[PDB]
Amino acid sequence: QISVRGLAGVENVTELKKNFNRHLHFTLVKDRNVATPRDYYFALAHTVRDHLVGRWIRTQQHYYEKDPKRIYYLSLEFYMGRTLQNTMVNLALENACDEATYQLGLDMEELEEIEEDAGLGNGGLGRLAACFLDSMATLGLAAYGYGIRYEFGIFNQKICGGWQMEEADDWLRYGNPWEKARPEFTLPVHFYGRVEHTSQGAKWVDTQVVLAMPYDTPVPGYRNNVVNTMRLWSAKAPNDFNLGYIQAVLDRNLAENISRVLYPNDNFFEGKELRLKQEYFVVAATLQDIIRRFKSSTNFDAFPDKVAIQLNDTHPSLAIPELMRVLVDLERLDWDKAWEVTVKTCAYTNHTVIPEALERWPVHLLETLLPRHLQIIYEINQRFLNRVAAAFPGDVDRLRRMSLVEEGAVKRINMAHLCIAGSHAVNGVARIHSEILKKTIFKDFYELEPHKFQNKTNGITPRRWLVLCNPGLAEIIAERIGEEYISDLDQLRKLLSYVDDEAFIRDVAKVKQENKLKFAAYLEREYKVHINPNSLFDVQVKRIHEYKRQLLNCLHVITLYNRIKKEPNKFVVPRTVMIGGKAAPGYHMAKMIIKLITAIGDVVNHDPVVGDRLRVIFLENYRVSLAEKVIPAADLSEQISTAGTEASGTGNMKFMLNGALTIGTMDGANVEMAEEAGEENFFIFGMRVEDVDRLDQRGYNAQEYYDRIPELRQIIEQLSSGFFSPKQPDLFKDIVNMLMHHDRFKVFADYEEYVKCQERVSALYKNPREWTRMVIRNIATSGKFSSDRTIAQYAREIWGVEPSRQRLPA
Amino acid sequence: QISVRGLAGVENVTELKKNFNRHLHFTLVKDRNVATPRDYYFALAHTVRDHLVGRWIRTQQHYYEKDPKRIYYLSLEFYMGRTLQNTMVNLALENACDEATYQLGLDMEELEEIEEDAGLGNGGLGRLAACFLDSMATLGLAAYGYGIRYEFGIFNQKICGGWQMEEADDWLRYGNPWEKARPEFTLPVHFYGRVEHTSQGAKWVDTQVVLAMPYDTPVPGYRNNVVNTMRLWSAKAPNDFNLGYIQAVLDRNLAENISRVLYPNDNFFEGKELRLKQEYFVVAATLQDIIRRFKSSTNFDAFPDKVAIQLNDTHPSLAIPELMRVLVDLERLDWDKAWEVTVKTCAYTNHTVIPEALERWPVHLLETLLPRHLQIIYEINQRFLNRVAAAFPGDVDRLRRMSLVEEGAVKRINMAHLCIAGSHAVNGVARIHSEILKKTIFKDFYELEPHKFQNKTNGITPRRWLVLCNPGLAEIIAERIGEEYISDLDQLRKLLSYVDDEAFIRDVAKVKQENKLKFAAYLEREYKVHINPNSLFDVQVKRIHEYKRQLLNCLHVITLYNRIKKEPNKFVVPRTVMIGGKAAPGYHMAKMIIKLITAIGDVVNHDPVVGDRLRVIFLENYRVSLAEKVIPAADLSEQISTAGTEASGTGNMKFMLNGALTIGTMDGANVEMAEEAGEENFFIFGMRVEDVDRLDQRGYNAQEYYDRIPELRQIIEQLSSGFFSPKQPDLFKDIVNMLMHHDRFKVFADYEEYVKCQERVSALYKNPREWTRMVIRNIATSGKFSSDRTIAQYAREIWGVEPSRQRLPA
Ligand SMILES: *Cc1c(COP(=O)(O)O)cnc(C)c1O
Ligand SMILES: *Cc1c(COP(=O)(O)O)cnc(C)c1O
Ligand SMILES: NC(=O)[C@]1(O)O[C@H](CO)[C@@H](O)[C@H](O)[C@H]1O
Ligand SMILES: NC(=O)[C@]1(O)O[C@H](CO)[C@@H](O)[C@H](O)[C@H]1O
């Protein structure tokens, strides 16, 4: 047992054991003779869950009594992952449960692997919401996460013949012990219908009704006895719905399809009606819940003083016109008063600048699905533009540029413009991203209302991303500076005074080696893949995207392969290059990239001359639980997006906290990471944002690089000739064609510097002692990237509430 | 507290209270300040449930150790109703829980009304299966009920403008505390595909797979510590199902529709594909489960010695060809051996003789959905007919009459013929019904294999239908003869020696009066309907059907009304005529009958001259929980089906056990009831089966009765002229037309005798003392109708197992 895992008290271990057996008997209705590992997992889960409800009930009662300002985080995604270990960590129960299960003759680690990941997210955006919930609870904020309880989360990825195959993520199959259905708080949501203008107000009538049933999941703070709530809505058809009798009952599945599945798109907008329904569904149910709670604390003047609503991207943007609809149509406030309240309550966070990801809903869709909201949006636009016209008289082009309504083939509503107009604060997620927002995409808005624009650099929770996934590292750190850093990561700076400590250097290197052996074993366990634990673990895990440039990584791998084949008996630092991530089902190029990666591995991993000097592994079904395993085992973190495309990135922060060195472009948070650790302790390369703009001004021509770089030319010709696809010589023609003629992310432009930088990485790896000292310099300066710092800034600069580290009673 | 309700021990009441609070806190995650009546109901349910799991686990372990012959009751319907009170009764916990909840400041009766009825049945057939499960557990048989877990049971009936409106029975909305999902025992079921004939056997290939997930519900025996299992299958699509990505996920609801809703037909066959899928789904999953259990006890010679499968009607008839398919195609037994095993294992129970209820599946449907089964059915038919031909040489018409395959417009498979051929026993559900089977419908089969035909008169469980719904009566009875009768209803005969006991007579009459006041109050509570508790409660509750003749009851009611209007100041015994029951959604005539009943009430209940002398009430949403309330309050039980149409009936037995006198035809079980109590203690009238046949031979002409009976003529003319439907004068034209020209059930033929018999009923009611003495004579002789007697006969005469009243350890 390690210190950071808590105490294994005699009384508690005894108590845990009896409750474990109690649940196995009464809850699972099983006996030790027929119980399976899954049964044991559930018995443990219910036992740990019991320890939360006491605190959960008290916390909520506490908020009712003190009535503090409530924070509502709206998101269509919450990538929670597993809950068992996280709960034990935050309740200081890990060692006791480990001991208790040990005494029952069970291996707790084995039981933990049985829990299904709660994959209600695509990647970074969804995981950020999850980290935020953890930090808000740890900082004592009266916060509530509101989303959708999808029956099916992000698909499970299978690799067949080197191609990605998707399969349903039936995560609720065996039940979810952490959630508590609250059918008593079901609320009605309206769709379609028409607007009636009467004597005293517009009325939205003849609507189709869909019920929203809430399910609550506890969110425990770190050892402070605070347990907040994440409420996810599930769609239910009313009982007189459609009420052939049989057909009417079967058609209920039509209204319930709203919460059936998560759209698997990352940084890509797909204007489908079902998606719009999901967005309104979450917003309508949530706002009714917010108002109800507010009325049970009626002059909405104090509404902004008791309520804060944070819009995670534009997905829940309809909250703005919905709040107006309720205040004007139902509460009967005058427009101006309602608008004042709405703006002071809402804040919007932008997460990307890529055009294909921006939400622009066709007017005809909103017109049919939400007629009243469209009218309100037009009125908002009308008044907003009048303000622009008054500030910039005669600037007619500005008017059309800032309009919430876009004219063209089909009229569309720019949801981002709607959010800026209706929020009192708009923030980016990394310093460089926030600056780009003010200088380009939202330049006109910044000039009109400069005070609204802010920055809030992303972060990750050190509980799940250090203590939970890397106890070995958390322990050697605690041995030197104590445990206080777990909720005050800035304290990691104290490790700087150990950079020359021969004992620490040895331990840091030891933990990393153990993590790699552990991972190298898991790889053969559940995926039969031998690898060499002595090689440098080169890892790039994140969603497959052209802007993330997994292709640039591929070009490097092929370069290393060709160089070995050219001079076989020359020494090179051994490497295991691991690439993993899911591709959106309809993203063809992304799916082709996965096939390319596996095709490269097929050639490289079976070439006798190469040996164990270079391996290429594609990490199947990358997800939160997998990240917790591979990140602690990484040596090199690949963060190579084209400058100006990755708003922030968060995987980069995870690797930095876990002892990996970073090779990357000056993009998103990478800039601040290098700034914190010192550029000499980072492997930076490639074009900066300004270099990219210069290339665009003069026109990017890939042919130029192909003509001037012999090694690059050889690679393209290998791909084109079928070297990596014998049976299908022209298999990768689309890839080559894109790279040569229409590459929006300029892979070739950064190739030379990337390869040269990779050489400097291999050089440092040859000097174990100095590699580790640089690692220590990274870990020691990763404090700024804790989501506790991020949330504290949102709290003080946007929500108007003070964070607290005070423990609530037991 | 009453004696039959158990002891309220000091220790147990204390224990119950703490566990109640424990579940309210840890299970429901609530505190006394926010808990609602529903929360309290669930806290109590989980507390009582806890007391079962100990016994449930032991019982099943016991069967594994002793390995007795297992009884499998297959049914597509199980009308269970509520479970809380029944569980308390069988565990002797009623008074303790009443006390415990009382001490917690809660009214247990109020909490019981919160439980949703488990309505997985249409009426008699489904309720019989439920009573049987109770008796099998009470008699210590190793029995298992197998069915489908419908998401939506029988629809909830709403009456609007006097018309029936149907609404979805979302019974699982708030969760089901009694069931335990067993996802670990999920089994695959195959559909469609094609048959491949290879070297060594036929193979069913290219099939569509649907998963069957089981949910187990405990079935406690009466105070014997036995807890059997009812396993219901739920449909689940495999995870690579259909695997547009989004559309593929949404289409999963197509395979899952199999267990979505119960077909609401009573005594009516509707050849829909979805229905056929449900029938095979339950059969395929169940048989795999049966075999697995059998292999874990391989020469299927002993299969019939360890397994008995009872087919509840022909709904699960595919069990016969499915068992053959498994034994021949998978286990590789020779046909003859497999057939021997199948026949010795299967037994079939017929529940009706009406032609429209008989299952005749179109060959083209089976051909596409279950190609292999169709081939097996043809082979069975081939060999069966060869046997007929050998026994009756030259009788070619017999061959075509007995064939399992019916020729005509579209070829069909007679499922009843399939069942007789493949079962070693075939039984009817009442003496007269079983005789009719041998003399008419199955005459040819009886002549070929006389030994197969038996009778097993239906019964009802005295636990739910006496102790639970009428504790007042159960108590005064126990006061005289003890409690032993609750599991040995024949002992009620001892009450015959009290027929002249002035104290008993007074108590019997007292309990009935209390029940009527209780019901008269409930009527105003949840349905705002005042009624007179002093009047005779005339009740007919059962599904709306032409053969059940609610129309004959209507004719009587109108007759009473007209007679009062003719001589207003003449005395008549006051009556409250109550009629209730659901009509199948697509049964037009049944829906018109409901409208007629409410229309009559509209006129009668508002006629000043009538006063409180006659009321006509339509009991809305008749279901099990409602039956438990109205039956104990009834004085007169209406069982007036046309002779030869009601196979048995069970509502008739419920009324007899609860102190109501019976007015009815010599049909179904009525015959045996009159025989047991003595015809002088029953109000019998109308044609006997032989009279009906005579009328058919000479041709039924309704006009004759209309021309000869003045009172009847007046009624038809009132209906025709719009007397009961002012705004819609011809509203009941279809009813009059049917009655006059195409009435298959001869309502008019029994009108005169029915009215005269009703007069004799009113005469006896005027003499309270003698009315009660006859009641005592009925209750005292109702013993034969306990389902314990029925199950004991099935056990000894069909299944080959001995029942047991031995208590299992605590
Ligand atoms: C942290 C995380 C991400 C985000 O990674 P980036 O490299 O910033 O894109 C995506 N997926 C999972 C499962 C994560 O844990
Ligand atoms: C007993 C019962 C029946 C069967 O009644 P019959 O009069 O035999 O048709 C039908 N429905 C319910 C709810 C029952 O309890
Ligand atoms: N918009 C997104 O989906 C994204 O994943 O969001 C993350 C969190 O802000 C960012 O870290 C990331 O850069 C961005 O791509
Ligand atoms: N076949 C049926 O559905 C029916 O309800 O079954 C009951 C039980 O045998 C019988 O009591 C009843 O007579 C019959 O109509």
PDB file of C-alpha atoms in Angstrom, chain A residues 30-196:
ATOM      1  CA  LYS A  30     -25.934 -14.338  -5.658  1.00  0.00           C
ATOM      2  CA  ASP A  31     -23.804 -16.600  -3.460  1.00  0.00           C
ATOM      3  CA  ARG A  32     -20.027 -17.101  -3.557  1.00  0.00           C
ATOM      4  CA  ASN A  33     -20.538 -20.377  -5.453  1.00  0.00           C
ATOM      5  CA  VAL A  34     -22.047 -18.820  -8.581  1.00  0.00           C
ATOM      6  CA  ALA A  35     -20.701 -15.263  -8.466  1.00  0.00           C
ATOM      7  CA  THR A  36     -18.553 -14.173 -11.405  1.00  0.00           C
ATOM      8  CA  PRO A  37     -15.922 -11.422 -11.576  1.00  0.00           C
ATOM      9  CA  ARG A  38     -18.615  -9.052 -12.851  1.00  0.00           C
ATOM     10  CA  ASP A  39     -20.824  -9.810  -9.852  1.00  0.00           C
ATOM     11  CA  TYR A  40     -17.918  -8.948  -7.574  1.00  0.00           C
ATOM     12  CA  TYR A  41     -17.346  -5.699  -9.437  1.00  0.00           C
ATOM     13  CA  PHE A  42     -20.970  -4.695  -8.835  1.00  0.00           C
ATOM     14  CA  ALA A  43     -20.866  -5.714  -5.176  1.00  0.00           C
ATOM     15  CA  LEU A  44     -17.840  -3.441  -4.722  1.00  0.00           C
ATOM     16  CA  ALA A  45     -19.451  -0.619  -6.734  1.00  0.00           C
ATOM     17  CA  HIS A  46     -22.594  -0.617  -4.585  1.00  0.00           C
ATOM     18  CA  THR A  47     -20.455  -0.718  -1.437  1.00  0.00           C
ATOM     19  CA  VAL A  48     -18.444   2.341  -2.496  1.00  0.00           C
ATOM     20  CA  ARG A  49     -21.586   4.077  -3.760  1.00  0.00           C
ATOM     21  CA  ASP A  50     -23.102   3.745  -0.272  1.00  0.00           C
ATOM     22  CA  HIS A  51     -20.332   5.997   1.085  1.00  0.00           C
ATOM     23  CA  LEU A  52     -21.387   8.817  -1.237  1.00  0.00           C
ATOM     24  CA  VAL A  53     -25.129   9.145  -0.707  1.00  0.00           C
ATOM     25  CA  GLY A  54     -24.676  10.436   2.831  1.00  0.00           C
ATOM     26  CA  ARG A  55     -22.471  13.254   1.556  1.00  0.00           C
ATOM     27  CA  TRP A  56     -24.572  13.729  -1.594  1.00  0.00           C
ATOM     28  CA  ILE A  57     -27.746  14.383   0.412  1.00  0.00           C
ATOM     29  CA  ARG A  58     -25.976  16.728   2.851  1.00  0.00           C
ATOM     30  CA  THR A  59     -24.304  18.738   0.109  1.00  0.00           C
ATOM     31  CA  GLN A  60     -27.587  19.390  -1.696  1.00  0.00           C
ATOM     32  CA  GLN A  61     -29.316  20.210   1.599  1.00  0.00           C
ATOM     33  CA  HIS A  62     -26.439  22.583   2.342  1.00  0.00           C
ATOM     34  CA  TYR A  63     -26.996  24.465  -0.930  1.00  0.00           C
ATOM     35  CA  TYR A  64     -30.705  24.745  -0.186  1.00  0.00           C
ATOM     36  CA  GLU A  65     -29.935  26.292   3.205  1.00  0.00           C
ATOM     37  CA  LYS A  66     -27.145  28.690   2.209  1.00  0.00           C
ATOM     38  CA  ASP A  67     -28.632  29.390  -1.241  1.00  0.00           C
ATOM     39  CA  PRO A  68     -25.369  30.338  -3.015  1.00  0.00           C
ATOM     40  CA  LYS A  69     -25.139  31.379  -6.666  1.00  0.00           C
ATOM     41  CA  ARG A  70     -25.655  28.239  -8.774  1.00  0.00           C
ATOM     42  CA  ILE A  71     -23.417  27.356 -11.728  1.00  0.00           C
ATOM     43  CA  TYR A  72     -25.000  25.455 -14.633  1.00  0.00           C
ATOM     44  CA  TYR A  73     -22.601  23.860 -17.112  1.00  0.00           C
ATOM     45  CA  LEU A  74     -24.529  22.906 -20.284  1.00  0.00           C
ATOM     46  CA  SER A  75     -22.889  20.437 -22.648  1.00  0.00           C
ATOM     47  CA  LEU A  76     -24.027  17.808 -25.133  1.00  0.00           C
ATOM     48  CA  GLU A  77     -20.975  15.776 -24.119  1.00  0.00           C
ATOM     49  CA  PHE A  78     -19.526  14.482 -20.833  1.00  0.00           C
ATOM     50  CA  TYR A  79     -16.701  11.967 -21.367  1.00  0.00           C
ATOM     51  CA  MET A  80     -16.604  10.536 -17.819  1.00  0.00           C
ATOM     52  CA  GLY A  81     -14.874   7.182 -18.375  1.00  0.00           C
ATOM     53  CA  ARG A  82     -14.924   4.778 -15.393  1.00  0.00           C
ATOM     54  CA  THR A  83     -16.215   5.860 -11.952  1.00  0.00           C
ATOM     55  CA  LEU A  84     -15.152   3.245  -9.354  1.00  0.00           C
ATOM     56  CA  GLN A  85     -11.482   4.130  -8.810  1.00  0.00           C
ATOM     57  CA  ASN A  86     -12.146   7.862  -9.125  1.00  0.00           C
ATOM     58  CA  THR A  87     -14.744   7.644  -6.380  1.00  0.00           C
ATOM     59  CA  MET A  88     -12.394   5.727  -4.088  1.00  0.00           C
ATOM     60  CA  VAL A  89      -9.616   8.254  -4.680  1.00  0.00           C
ATOM     61  CA  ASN A  90     -11.793  11.267  -3.826  1.00  0.00           C
ATOM     62  CA  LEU A  91     -13.175   9.539  -0.731  1.00  0.00           C
ATOM     63  CA  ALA A  92      -9.765   8.262   0.432  1.00  0.00           C
ATOM     64  CA  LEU A  93     -11.041   4.662   0.247  1.00  0.00           C
ATOM     65  CA  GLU A  94      -8.576   3.060  -2.147  1.00  0.00           C
ATOM     66  CA  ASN A  95      -6.306   1.231   0.308  1.00  0.00           C
ATOM     67  CA  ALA A  96      -9.174   0.108   2.563  1.00  0.00           C
ATOM     68  CA  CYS A  97     -11.080  -1.369  -0.392  1.00  0.00           C
ATOM     69  CA  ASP A  98      -7.880  -2.920  -1.726  1.00  0.00           C
ATOM     70  CA  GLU A  99      -7.299  -4.548   1.661  1.00  0.00           C
ATOM     71  CA  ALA A 100     -10.936  -5.574   2.118  1.00  0.00           C
ATOM     72  CA  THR A 101     -11.145  -7.192  -1.321  1.00  0.00           C
ATOM     73  CA  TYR A 102      -7.746  -8.781  -0.745  1.00  0.00           C
ATOM     74  CA  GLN A 103      -9.061 -10.390   2.443  1.00  0.00           C
ATOM     75  CA  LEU A 104     -12.057 -11.644   0.457  1.00  0.00           C
ATOM     76  CA  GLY A 105      -9.587 -13.289  -1.900  1.00  0.00           C
ATOM     77  CA  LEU A 106     -10.187 -10.899  -4.793  1.00  0.00           C
ATOM     78  CA  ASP A 107      -7.887  -8.704  -6.883  1.00  0.00           C
ATOM     79  CA  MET A 108      -9.397  -5.220  -6.971  1.00  0.00           C
ATOM     80  CA  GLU A 109      -7.489  -4.199 -10.105  1.00  0.00           C
ATOM     81  CA  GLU A 110      -9.105  -7.096 -11.948  1.00  0.00           C
ATOM     82  CA  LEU A 111     -12.544  -5.953 -10.818  1.00  0.00           C
ATOM     83  CA  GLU A 112     -11.868  -2.375 -11.936  1.00  0.00           C
ATOM     84  CA  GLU A 113     -11.233  -3.513 -15.519  1.00  0.00           C
ATOM     85  CA  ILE A 114     -14.795  -4.849 -15.659  1.00  0.00           C
ATOM     86  CA  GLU A 115     -16.443  -1.419 -15.443  1.00  0.00           C
ATOM     87  CA  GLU A 116     -17.649  -0.020 -18.764  1.00  0.00           C
ATOM     88  CA  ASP A 117     -16.431   3.454 -19.740  1.00  0.00           C
ATOM     89  CA  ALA A 118     -19.120   6.128 -19.665  1.00  0.00           C
ATOM     90  CA  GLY A 119     -18.323   7.349 -23.186  1.00  0.00           C
ATOM     91  CA  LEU A 120     -20.782  10.183 -23.633  1.00  0.00           C
ATOM     92  CA  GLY A 121     -18.244  12.251 -25.553  1.00  0.00           C
ATOM     93  CA  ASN A 122     -16.028  12.297 -28.648  1.00  0.00           C
ATOM     94  CA  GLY A 123     -12.770  13.469 -27.169  1.00  0.00           C
ATOM     95  CA  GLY A 124     -11.284  16.715 -25.896  1.00  0.00           C
ATOM     96  CA  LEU A 125     -14.491  18.730 -25.599  1.00  0.00           C
ATOM     97  CA  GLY A 126     -16.320  16.006 -23.698  1.00  0.00           C
ATOM     98  CA  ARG A 127     -13.324  15.160 -21.484  1.00  0.00           C
ATOM     99  CA  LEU A 128     -12.890  18.842 -20.587  1.00  0.00           C
ATOM    100  CA  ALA A 129     -16.443  18.964 -19.248  1.00  0.00           C
ATOM    101  CA  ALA A 130     -15.640  15.882 -17.150  1.00  0.00           C
ATOM    102  CA  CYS A 131     -12.450  17.403 -15.686  1.00  0.00           C
ATOM    103  CA  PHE A 132     -14.350  20.621 -14.997  1.00  0.00           C
ATOM    104  CA  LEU A 133     -17.027  18.799 -12.975  1.00  0.00           C
ATOM    105  CA  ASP A 134     -14.308  17.232 -10.847  1.00  0.00           C
ATOM    106  CA  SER A 135     -12.640  20.609 -10.234  1.00  0.00           C
ATOM    107  CA  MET A 136     -15.894  22.437  -9.475  1.00  0.00           C
ATOM    108  CA  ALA A 137     -16.733  19.892  -6.762  1.00  0.00           C
ATOM    109  CA  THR A 138     -13.176  20.018  -5.433  1.00  0.00           C
ATOM    110  CA  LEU A 139     -13.408  23.827  -5.254  1.00  0.00           C
ATOM    111  CA  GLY A 140     -16.752  23.758  -3.460  1.00  0.00           C
ATOM    112  CA  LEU A 141     -18.862  25.442  -6.132  1.00  0.00           C
ATOM    113  CA  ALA A 142     -22.627  24.812  -6.226  1.00  0.00           C
ATOM    114  CA  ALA A 143     -22.314  23.434  -9.768  1.00  0.00           C
ATOM    115  CA  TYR A 144     -24.531  21.219 -11.906  1.00  0.00           C
ATOM    116  CA  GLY A 145     -23.583  19.445 -15.109  1.00  0.00           C
ATOM    117  CA  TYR A 146     -26.520  19.136 -17.517  1.00  0.00           C
ATOM    118  CA  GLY A 147     -26.532  16.917 -20.583  1.00  0.00           C
ATOM    119  CA  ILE A 148     -28.113  13.983 -22.384  1.00  0.00           C
ATOM    120  CA  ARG A 149     -28.079  10.381 -21.232  1.00  0.00           C
ATOM    121  CA  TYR A 150     -27.305   8.719 -24.566  1.00  0.00           C
ATOM    122  CA  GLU A 151     -28.220   5.034 -24.673  1.00  0.00           C
ATOM    123  CA  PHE A 152     -25.250   4.607 -26.973  1.00  0.00           C
ATOM    124  CA  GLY A 153     -22.059   6.619 -26.503  1.00  0.00           C
ATOM    125  CA  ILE A 154     -19.039   6.873 -28.800  1.00  0.00           C
ATOM    126  CA  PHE A 155     -18.789   3.670 -30.843  1.00  0.00           C
ATOM    127  CA  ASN A 156     -16.362   0.891 -29.951  1.00  0.00           C
ATOM    128  CA  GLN A 157     -13.677   0.679 -32.623  1.00  0.00           C
ATOM    129  CA  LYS A 158     -12.693  -2.667 -34.126  1.00  0.00           C
ATOM    130  CA  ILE A 159      -9.862  -3.028 -36.643  1.00  0.00           C
ATOM    131  CA  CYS A 160     -10.586  -5.539 -39.425  1.00  0.00           C
ATOM    132  CA  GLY A 161      -8.156  -6.091 -42.274  1.00  0.00           C
ATOM    133  CA  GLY A 162      -6.529  -2.888 -41.125  1.00  0.00           C
ATOM    134  CA  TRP A 163      -9.788  -0.944 -41.552  1.00  0.00           C
ATOM    135  CA  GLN A 164     -11.912   0.678 -38.860  1.00  0.00           C
ATOM    136  CA  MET A 165     -15.202  -1.052 -38.084  1.00  0.00           C
ATOM    137  CA  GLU A 166     -17.768   0.591 -35.784  1.00  0.00           C
ATOM    138  CA  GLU A 167     -19.918  -1.209 -33.261  1.00  0.00           C
ATOM    139  CA  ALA A 168     -22.582   0.005 -30.858  1.00  0.00           C
ATOM    140  CA  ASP A 169     -21.452   1.083 -27.409  1.00  0.00           C
ATOM    141  CA  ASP A 170     -24.199  -0.607 -25.377  1.00  0.00           C
ATOM    142  CA  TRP A 171     -22.742   0.742 -22.121  1.00  0.00           C
ATOM    143  CA  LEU A 172     -25.967   0.333 -20.134  1.00  0.00           C
ATOM    144  CA  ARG A 173     -26.301  -3.389 -20.916  1.00  0.00           C
ATOM    145  CA  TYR A 174     -25.381  -4.607 -17.403  1.00  0.00           C
ATOM    146  CA  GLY A 175     -26.827  -1.546 -15.697  1.00  0.00           C
ATOM    147  CA  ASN A 176     -25.263   1.616 -14.277  1.00  0.00           C
ATOM    148  CA  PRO A 177     -24.822   1.541 -10.463  1.00  0.00           C
ATOM    149  CA  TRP A 178     -23.772   5.177 -10.279  1.00  0.00           C
ATOM    150  CA  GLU A 179     -26.934   6.813 -11.642  1.00  0.00           C
ATOM    151  CA  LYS A 180     -30.252   7.392  -9.868  1.00  0.00           C
ATOM    152  CA  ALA A 181     -33.340   7.811 -12.015  1.00  0.00           C
ATOM    153  CA  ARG A 182     -35.592  10.659 -10.910  1.00  0.00           C
ATOM    154  CA  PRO A 183     -38.837   9.996 -12.863  1.00  0.00           C
ATOM    155  CA  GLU A 184     -40.626  12.294 -10.416  1.00  0.00           C
ATOM    156  CA  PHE A 185     -38.893  15.331 -11.918  1.00  0.00           C
ATOM    157  CA  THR A 186     -39.847  14.584 -15.527  1.00  0.00           C
ATOM    158  CA  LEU A 187     -40.497  17.702 -17.640  1.00  0.00           C
ATOM    159  CA  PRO A 188     -42.240  18.267 -21.006  1.00  0.00           C
ATOM    160  CA  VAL A 189     -40.360  19.543 -24.080  1.00  0.00           C
ATOM    161  CA  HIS A 190     -42.150  20.991 -27.138  1.00  0.00           C
ATOM    162  CA  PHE A 191     -41.433  20.609 -30.869  1.00  0.00           C
ATOM    163  CA  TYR A 192     -42.972  21.792 -34.159  1.00  0.00           C
ATOM    164  CA  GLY A 193     -46.316  23.563 -33.782  1.00  0.00           C
ATOM    165  CA  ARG A 194     -47.001  27.159 -34.821  1.00  0.00           C
ATOM    166  CA  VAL A 195     -47.087  30.660 -33.358  1.00  0.00           C
ATOM    167  CA  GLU A 196     -50.306  32.465 -32.497  1.00  0.00           C
TER     168      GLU A 196
END
